[PDB]
Design a protein around this nucleic acid. Structure first.
Ligand SMILES: CC[C@H]1OC(=O)[C@H](C)[C@@H](OC(=O)NCCCOCCC#Cc2ccc3c(=O)c(C(=O)O)cn(C)c3c2)[C@H](C)[C@@H](O[C@@H]2O[C@H](C)C[C@H](N(C)C)[C@H]2O)[C@](C)(OC)C[C@@H](C)C(=O)[C@H](C)[C@H]2NC(=O)O[C@@]21C
Ligand SMILES: [Mg+2]
Lengths: 112, 120, 48, 43
RNA sequence: UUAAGUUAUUAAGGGCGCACGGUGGAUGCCUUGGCACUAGAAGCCGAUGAAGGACGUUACUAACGACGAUAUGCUUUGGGGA
RNA sequence: CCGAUAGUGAACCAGUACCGUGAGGGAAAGGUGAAAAGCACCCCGGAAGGGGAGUGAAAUAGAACCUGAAACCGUGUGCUU
RNA sequence: CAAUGGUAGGAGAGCGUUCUAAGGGCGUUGAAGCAUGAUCGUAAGGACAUGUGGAGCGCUUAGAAGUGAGAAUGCCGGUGUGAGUAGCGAAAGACGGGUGAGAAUCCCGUCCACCGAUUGACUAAGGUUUCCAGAGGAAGGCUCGUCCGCUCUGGGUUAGUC
RNA sequence: CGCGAGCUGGGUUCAGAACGUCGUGAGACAGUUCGGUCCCUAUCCGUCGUGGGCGUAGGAAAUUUGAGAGGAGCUGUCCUU
RNA sequence: AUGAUGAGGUUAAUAGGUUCGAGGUGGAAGCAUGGUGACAUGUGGAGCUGACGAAUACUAAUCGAUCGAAGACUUAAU
């Protein structure tokens, strides 16, 4: 009834991916894929990938159909941040936090 | 008109180079603004080609770059000759147009709306 | 020219109410049935 | 601008370096402390 | 039906509670290592080239021990028991 | 007497990263499980990841690996505006 | 029957944390921690139940202390806000073909443009392997990256006269 | 003695120098004189513009009254009588 | 600034092009004549002409999709 797919430590800031995941929340699988493939943002290819993984998992493990599949819920939360520095002026150094993201998507057949 | 985010000399040069390349290939891929701005230049060159008198030839020589095309059977002829011998005939009866434009999706490196400008 | 105080979570989430991406202008393609952007050429088929 | 430390192998090994510290008793001292400390680069 | 009066609904977002996740490395439990001592050895090593090192040495190969062209060691006695 | 912000600076290739021309100065960093049994195959993906199946008492014990708090970031919503 | 605001401050009674002595106990039929709860005492605080947790820990009496943190522009470590804001470090690129999961950014080609007492060729000082050919894409490149001064593998410096 | 996170920096008030005066001297004088680095990416309130949401007991397109509010508001000379 | 406002989306002049014109510049090119040459003259107010005016669907506004009412109670006239 539910199928899971997760991408961990994706090299995109979670607040940047969340903008895109605020569109495919609760839409149908086909419409969701059409959005991702056409939204011109950076995170979009990495999330489309997760949707295909989720649908493949559903078909191959639960033998449920990929037409009545709505996106039960899809979110993204922080990951193991990488700390770097930028040489700024007058000998001072400022920090740069290269963040990451733990993308999760679950697709459901809307039943029990 | 548009400035294309560029100076005057660099734009003059870009527009004429893009027009030449279009004439060579008969359809190219570029961004919307530059397609919208090369449309007029290429259309006007074809007009200079629909007459073929020496004055219009000499005057169209201003814009086109000097390039060589290798046709089938290793036949060679330049952009002026193409314009005045292979494209004047095609549009002898059409009284405008000469070009179409087909918007395409945004590119990856930017959000630029790539398009294909083609000689119709 | 420096923040005199913190911007609480309430104020933060409030300011970004209007900060969002719009769903794409997508319509179904007449030759293949896959979605395409309106006024653009379908990238799956290559039509109009 | 000309900054400091214009490197030079010869002067580096002349003013510093094993044989220079072994030329004066005070030079012999710093090697003594550096071995007591267990240093790896002694001169 | 027309007047005059009253009152929802709304939630772009936000508040408070609740549930479920993430990051993060506190807490608890643990000890490879330390600290302070007591008792008994010992309390000088080098031109017989010392202390420290450098370069090496393995079947392959860098590091750390170990050992030096007889180089991941060689001879011998006594143990030694797969 | 200390139990990893303690106890040596150093429980871990530490007077080492590193810093300085040099004297010198000097860190951070322990914990899968009883056993490595360290996840045969299948599925999406170029890969990183993941989801099944299997190992195990346990895999929100899967190698960044015991417990896993708070700040902080999310996804739902009962009552509000 | 009387008294009970209180700062510097004096006096008294106590609650808690670690360890030790003894006695008596609890523990994979689930300890310590952790989280939740609408529970108890005058307070410091004490229990109980349910989850996670996978081995130690309470209670009584008495002893000792590295014994109680909210502030020291305290130290160390994490994470915020400013904010998807500033910045993206002097400059001319365009287009066809190819390569790939992916291309303004990599390879080839044409055109165009910049330097040219130099952004050209040598050679010193200094750096040491950055040199070359295959391969890769985590990280480093202020973007991307199939590319590289990056990573992996294997190679490369030959003098009687310099 | 409105206004420097709007501007200048001539005077004054750092370090240099010099003259007059005082001090044995180092130095000194609100006595002169020549010279002398003006940093800041705006969070909040405020203010000038410009959007979206919702409410106006149905959903809409256009024209509107005006409760209020703001802006103007100066004045010369010549001729005639 | 962006978003708004306004003119338009084929049953179409919204923009581009084409044709004509306004305005600007000032005598294009190639010829022929004359000059040793530097040049001059006629063709021919010619040639060119970004935003300005008009006509023309030649090219692009082709296809499509989303949102959007069914009208509360109370009392008095009705
Ligand atoms: C470029 C960025 C840096 O900014 C600055 O330099 C700016 C320009 C500076 O503005 C000013 O000069 N005054 C405004 C101009 C007034 O002229 C009148 C004529 C004079 C004089 C004078 C008198 C005595 C001395 C002195 O005795 C002496 C010595 O050495 O003994 C050295 N000289 C030079 C003196 C000169 C800042 C802003 C300055 O603050 C201001 O000073 C005042 C004393 C008080 C002001 N308030 C409190 C009323 C204050 O706002 C400071 C002190 O800087 C020197 C700022 C401090 C924080 C810094 O240090 C920062 C980090 C700066 N350093 C740097 O690197 O970045 C800077 C930001
Ligand atoms: Mg510097």
């Amino acid at each position: 009834m539910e199928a899971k797919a997760v991408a961990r430590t994706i090299r995109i800031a979670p607040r940047k991916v969340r903008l895109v995941l605020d569109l495919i929340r609760g839409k149908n699988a086909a419409e969701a894929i059409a959005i991702l493939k056409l939204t011109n943002k950076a995170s979009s290819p990495v999330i489309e990938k997760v949707l295909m993984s989720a649908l493949a998992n559903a078909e191959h493990n639960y033998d449920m159909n990929t037409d009545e599949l709505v996106v039960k819920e899809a979110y993204a939360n922080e990951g193991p941040t990488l700390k770097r520095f930028r040489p700024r002026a007058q000998g001072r150094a400022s920090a740069i936090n290269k963040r990451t993201s733990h993308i999760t998507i679950v697709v459901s057949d809307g039943k029990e | 008109y548009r400035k294309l985010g560029r100076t005057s000399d660099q734009r003059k040069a870009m527009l004429r180079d893009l027009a030449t390349s279009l004439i060579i290939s008969e359809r190219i891929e570029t961004t919307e603004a530059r397609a919208k701005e090369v449309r007029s230049v290429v259309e006007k060159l074809i007009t200079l080609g629909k007459k073929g008198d020496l004055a219009s030839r000499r005057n169209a020589a201003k814009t086109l770059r000097n390039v060589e095309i290798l046709n089938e059977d290793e036949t060679t002829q330049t952009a002026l000759q193409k314009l005045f011998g292979e494209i004047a005939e095609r549009y002898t009866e059409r009284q405008g147009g000469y070009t179409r434009i087909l918007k395409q999706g945004p590119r990856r490196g930017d959000g630029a709306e790539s398009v294909i400008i083609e000689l119709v | 020219a420096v923040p005199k105080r913190r911007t609480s979570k309430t104020r933060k989430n409030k300011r970004r109410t209007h900060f969002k991406i719009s769903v794409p202008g997508m319509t179904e393609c007449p030759n293949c049935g896959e979605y395409k952007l309106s006024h653009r050429v379908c990238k799956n088929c290559g039509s109009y | 601008v000309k900054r400091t430390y214009q490197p030079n192998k010869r002067k580096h090994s002349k003013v510093h370096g094993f044989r220079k510290r072994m030329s004066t008793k005070n030079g012999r001292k710093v090697l003594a402390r550096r071995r007591r400390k267990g240093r790896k680069v002694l001169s």
